[PDB]
Amino acid sequence: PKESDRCGGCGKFTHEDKKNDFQWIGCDSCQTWYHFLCSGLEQFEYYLYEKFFCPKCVPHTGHSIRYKVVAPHRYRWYSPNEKHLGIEVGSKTWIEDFITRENTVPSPTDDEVCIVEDGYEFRREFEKLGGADNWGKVFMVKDMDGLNMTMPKPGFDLEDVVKIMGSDYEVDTIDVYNQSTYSMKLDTFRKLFRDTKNRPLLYNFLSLEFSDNNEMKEIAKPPRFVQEISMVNRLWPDVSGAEYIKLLQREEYLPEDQRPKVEQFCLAGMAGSYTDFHVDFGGSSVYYHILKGEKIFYIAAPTEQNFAAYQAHETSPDTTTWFGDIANGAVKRVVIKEGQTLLIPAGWIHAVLTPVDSLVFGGNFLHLGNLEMQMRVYHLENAIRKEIRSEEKFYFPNFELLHWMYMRNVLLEKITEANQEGSDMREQEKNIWTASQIMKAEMERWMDRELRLGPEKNAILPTDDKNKIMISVRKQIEIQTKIQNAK
């Protein structure tokens, strides 16, 4: 074809394909083109450099020259055409100023957050309120003792992470001032993190999930109470031996690549980092333990008034208004220090500031006690997703499939068994019963939608299998009611 269009390289015309896409970058010195994945750059650098300046030139051309900071109050901090526009939440200018008025945001009430000294008190207060089934307030636990939450011994830091995970492990990382996400080698982040004096840009990753790393997955685990209620954990039990065999023998096995991986995250952020208001995907609950550093959460209860304000905030193109300034005083401030743990139920809207370099272990999960609220957040996400175009990776992996499997593999069996004896589930399983109805009703809406306009992309559950599950669900449900009407 044309030699000048050859990478690079690579020395090739069409790249094999993290994902190079179909993208090239050109050397401002030697003028030869490079596939992005062949340029030696990482995704986080793609937009940074005004001049580049490939490896075949750096020893005799110098390092790439990055754009000069022209508009520190804009995500596009490098664009002179935006100099005159408004301060964007949370650009460098925005965060800088927010840090100074920050502590004026009111503290939460006792009904919003409950602070406890240790895991034993948490347990007591958790049970007073009705436990996980009736879990509505956030808890801060100062000392983790009694939580049964496996964590690293301090002295553990970023260095240990990169050693365990791998220097070339790529993690989706937030460019804080640009308010965007890019891949970045763990070793690159560590270099940048290590340099505490020279930080032209701040970085914060939330999304290093290590549940598939045989070493890390043993070092930081969710509290026991989280493991006991996790729907994902119930469906993909990390069991062995005969238990696993029984698993396969019932059609209860689910592929590892279908497992939502969100329950074991490592988060590391630079001081000055800000993450803006959001509800965790799928309306999942969150555990959040500070190994090192400090975090300030700004939180708002999952009420309809708040949900309406949030939905509007998320669908408006406006970029200059802090959600707290329009939430009618719903935003409360809570500080979490080294060693302390936050436990957040479904639906809580929250932003977070990182006053100090930090290292956090956290995780997301779904549970039956928050089923309604999880569906409610799901409707919220879908409503927002109609207006704005986002990426599927920022939403809960395989949300619907997870429920099809939970209904099939868990609830169906429980209802069937009760039906086959006595047996009014309201006695020793009121919770299981009410969840079944709630989940069923939601899934009836999904079914009708799939019929009205067809299935989504390829896989994973054929429409026919869904209809067969629903038929079986309706049957056992109708039977159990008859038993409840009789008794």
Binding site: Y75, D172, I174, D175, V176, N178, Q179, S180, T181, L206, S207, E209, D257, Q258, R259, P260, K261, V262, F265, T275, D276, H278, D280, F281, N364, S390, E391, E392, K393, F394, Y395, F396, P397, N398
Partner: peptide, 10 residues
């Protein structure tokens, strides 16, 4: 913009 927890499922 796009600064939010990220997976890829799967």
């Amino acid at each position: 913009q796009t600064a939010r927890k990220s997976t890829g499922g799967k």
